[PDB]
Amino acid sequence: ATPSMMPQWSYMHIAGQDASEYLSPGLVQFARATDTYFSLGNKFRNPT
């Protein structure tokens, strides 16, 4: 990519990881557990 601007980009999910590996695993498990009625999916980012 552009390494000199990779850190901040990754910090704010500019081009970093998906919302399944920076999220603490407990939280992702939680969201998958209660997506049916308390979806938190849209609160987060999935950088592409």
């Binding site: 407990g26 557990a33 209660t34 009625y37």
Partner: peptide, 12 residues
């Protein structure tokens, strides 16, 4: 879900 079919949060 779970395996006694559907639900949500008695599974973490």
């Amino acid at each position: 879900s779970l395996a006694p079919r559907h639900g949500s949060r008695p599974f973490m």
